[PDB]
Subunit: 267 residues, 4 copies
């Protein structure tokens, strides 16, 4: 239990990676406040964890919902140690040529309001509390914040924008708050596309050096690491690629050592 | 005259770096179409260059103004070889803690609609023409797309977003259109801040390795290079840091060799 | 005890960061084999940890000493799960202009043989064992592998070379062995300079965003993370900057939020 | 003729990319001194260019040969404006598992002495002249200095080491000398492998976004750009990826827009 007594606020924690994070942080001894728009999924979370979790129904695009989540977390758990802005929506890799002219403006706002402005509002709302606890922020980025072909122009630009948030907020909030970003890979979640615009495992296993798409729980360890003051004190402004090795894949094969057992005579 | 007969479309070309680019590209033999919201400054440009330039008054946030600029450029000059999305607004380095809650939503849209959506709309509007000419796109980024302290969270995230546009559009438009980004530094322009939120040379000379802030005309050579098919054919998805060396400055001094003349006995 | 029953081989583990790593990994339940040239310091380590550690006196530049360390680790502890090539020497930030012509060749070999070839030999020697255990390699890099002014040309080029080892070996050894690199910062160790060429805390606290130079034990958490199969399975080819935020420091100040308590009225 | 009256020194200029560079720089009006070990190829160069070129037979691993090249260039052409360290040898992508134990030490020195130490010696020898002319250094790197699978561990680590030279020497030689690096791609040259260890176009066209391997002359434009004081004054410490887009290639296809003509109805 590395995070006993710590309080953590997670946006988009009712499903997918966010939900795995709530489960992992509770197992590490933390209390977790979650801001999510789905009342039903938040109810499930409260059923499973009881008073180890606090559900706040609200939209990340709303600074007022964000401030309500922060004040309720402070009221219930006394502080906010770690903030994990994670809620997001994908653009279903719609290429530029396939983005319809009539909804490009609306899709731009949907994607950027959720994925980028929602991240800024979480930090703005929790700032006073994070400074008081000398806490930290861990942004969920994705391989889309580093390499192409993880989404179309909208999602790729929005996730690259979060790299800029990591660097600029690591500078601005130092020396009180540490700010780091996790470049997580593909997950079998319920990630939705933009309303404005109306397999993963098998496709990707040939391009990932690790040779398999990780389960959603295998992506929680990096967040625990960055949230641990005793292990991550020198980490601020860090960007951890954590997607199975997409950035080091080969030209013609994902992995270059599929034949290592045979080459070294291991059995 | 490296670009004789080439046609170039520049957004935000009526002032500052954009205007220097128009002057340089005309001097290289190109015809230049400019999309800018300032009627008055566009008039000045037309006075100076005559029919080597074409002024289109319009907003980069409007896909219809962008499409009007592209069709007028094609009508007048027959094609579009190079597109340079460059219009932008700064956030006056307003830190997160100083961004007022009541105008954060509006400032987010002003900054992102101009600096990011305006860049996407320029490419969307000029796509058919760029594919026909096997042309290229050169985005104006800034040191703010790479390092902190070049603006607050809004401008730093928006310029980092353009790095994502470079990578994703270089992939998507290959092999027909090359897409590259220029990380230009500080200029003595008329760069304005957000309406929503209501020296440079002397401050920065101690932190720049080159020891002086470059004149606006010294930043035009990199664009000419990327627009030259005979010199930049292997360049796609490239990001050129071009800001005086901010990224390689030292810990305690901008430059590490201020004493080299004395150390080597040069006079 | 996150690494109970794991076996770890550390080069240069008798002093400084290496020694802190041995202490931390033993505390996490691992058995640790150490390859170091100092017989005396290895004796101290064996005194402190008894049969939780194994000392092998040898030079990292010698492939035969490296192979002896690997076979002794396998003989004693049955396997090798994690390999941490860490031994190194600094160049005392001797700039290019100050490197004497008469010893430049010798200094080049001393620095590169230890810091780079020593890392390749450790992986070559432990390869068969790492493939059998599906283990991982964690290279100690430094801020010198990312930014200037952490050493002169020799040390900066040698540490940047290790970034190339991370990427190329992450590709080549996948999908069996994960390869990651830690960009650790300044430590109060006994790091020596090159024989060929014959404060830290107080100097650096004004340039580090965290505002203090971390103790040597605060740099061990990132290695434990990467060595934990249950937390770092998606991490291969990763480079973690872990130096107090040097890469996100400001232009005129290390940290941009020294006044946050006063600005937010915290007491 | 962008470089009339400029003097340029190129190492490894008698063949492949180096030779194309000599041809291009002479065509731009420069005088070029070349340091190469091949007497025969240097003779050919002198036959083709006459007294626009100066051939110095010598080894880049020898600081004395390097100093002889620099003093002869200064004697003949009066100065040294641009220095282009370019000589190199490949490792034939020999993976770590295939590197023989008995020649690993010798191969390490052959590769690093030529590719890395040869680059340091060129700058050391030409330093006084570069400071006097406020000149610049352009290192030939390669895609191997950025991504895996461009060579084995030795060549990939050596080319990544040159990125460290770019950053550290850009800092140390500022504000007098600009230092930049070109990440050139695959060429149909006579690049040899290590003596110690005893198609390209067709293989790579499916992974390059541009869809073809560039001719050797198409890689010379970036060097001319960086050597032009009037166009590259703000460029120092820059790293230009220039390899056909390897870094932005897709997961399943090199280019993502092979069908753009059909999708946009162009003919
Ligand atoms: N699934 C993938 O392949 C993947 C890959 C990489 C990175 N990511 C990123 O991981 C993060 C989590 O995505 P996920 O896969 O877990 O998706 P998910 O859809 O399962 O989870 C998103 C959660 O955010 C909540 N949410 C969505 N919009 C909201 C809004 N406006 N206000 C409040 N809550 C809102 C949803 O209700 C949901 O509970 C996102 O940032 C996503 O971009 C996902
Ligand atoms: N000035 C600097 O220090 C600096 C530094 C780095 C990068 N940049 C970038 O360089 C680019 C040019 O900025 P600049 O310094 O030349 O500024 P500038 O203000 O002089 O030029 C901006 C031009 O864009 C036009 N413009 C602004 N908003 C518009 C809109 N909505 N629609 C159409 N046209 C619009 C303006 O009328 C003006 O002519 C921008 O992307 C900016 O972010 C500037
Ligand atoms: N001290 C710093 O500021 C610092 C900063 C960043 C990164 N680093 C890196 O951390 C790693 C550890 O350095 P440190 O500070 O702990 O230094 P240190 O001198 O205290 O430890 C180096 C250890 O390596 C052993 N060693 C040296 N040469 C050897 C050889 N040829 N063969 C076998 N063993 C040998 C030494 O005997 C010693 O026990 C190195 O890679 C160094 O580059 C150090
Ligand atoms: N060919 C490729 O695919 C390729 C790809 C990317 C980068 N590069 C790089 O481009 C640069 C030029 O390589 P190239 O393709 O033109 O190869 P090349 O073999 O045709 O040219 C190398 C030149 O260097 C000279 N040389 C070699 N060792 C020398 C030494 N010890 N002293 C003096 N001169 C020496 C050779 O005689 C030759 O004239 C190298 O740095 C190489 O790493 C090559």
């Amino acid at each position: 239990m590395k995070l006993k007594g710590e309080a953590v606020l997670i946006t988009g924690g009712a499903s997918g990676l966010g939900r795995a994070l709530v489960d992992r942080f509770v197992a590490e001894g933390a209390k977790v406040a979650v801001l999510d728009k789905s009342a039903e999924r938040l109810a499930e979370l409260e059923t499973d964890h009881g008073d180890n979790v606090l559900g706040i129904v609200g939209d990340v695009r709303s600074l007022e919902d964000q401030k309500q989540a922060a004040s309720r977390c402070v009221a219930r758990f006394g502080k906010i140690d770690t903030l994990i802005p994670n809620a997001g929506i994908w653009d279903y890799s719609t290429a530029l040529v396939d983005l319809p002219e009539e909804s490009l403006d609306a899709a731009f706002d949907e994607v950027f309001h959720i994925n980028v402005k929602g991240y800024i509002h979480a930090v703005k709302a929790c700032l006073p509390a994070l400074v008081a606890s000398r806490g930290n922020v861990i942004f969920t980025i994705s391989n889309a914040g580093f390499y192409p072909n993880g989404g179309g122009p909208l999602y790729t630009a929005a996730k690259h924008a979060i790299v800029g948030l990591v660097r600029e907020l690591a500078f601005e909030l130092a020396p009180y708050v540490r700010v780091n970003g996790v470049g997580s890979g593909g997950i079998n979640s319920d990630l939705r596309g933009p309303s404005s615009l109306g397999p993963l495992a098998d496709m990707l296993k040939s391009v990932l050096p690790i040779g398999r798409m990780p389960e959603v729980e295998e992506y929680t360890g990096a967040y625990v690491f960055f949230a641990t003051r005793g292990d991550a004190a020198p980490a601020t402004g860090a960007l951890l690629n954590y997607d199975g090795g997409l950035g080091v894949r080969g030209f013609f094969s994902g992995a270059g050592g599929n034949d290592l057992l045979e080459q070294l005579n291991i059995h």
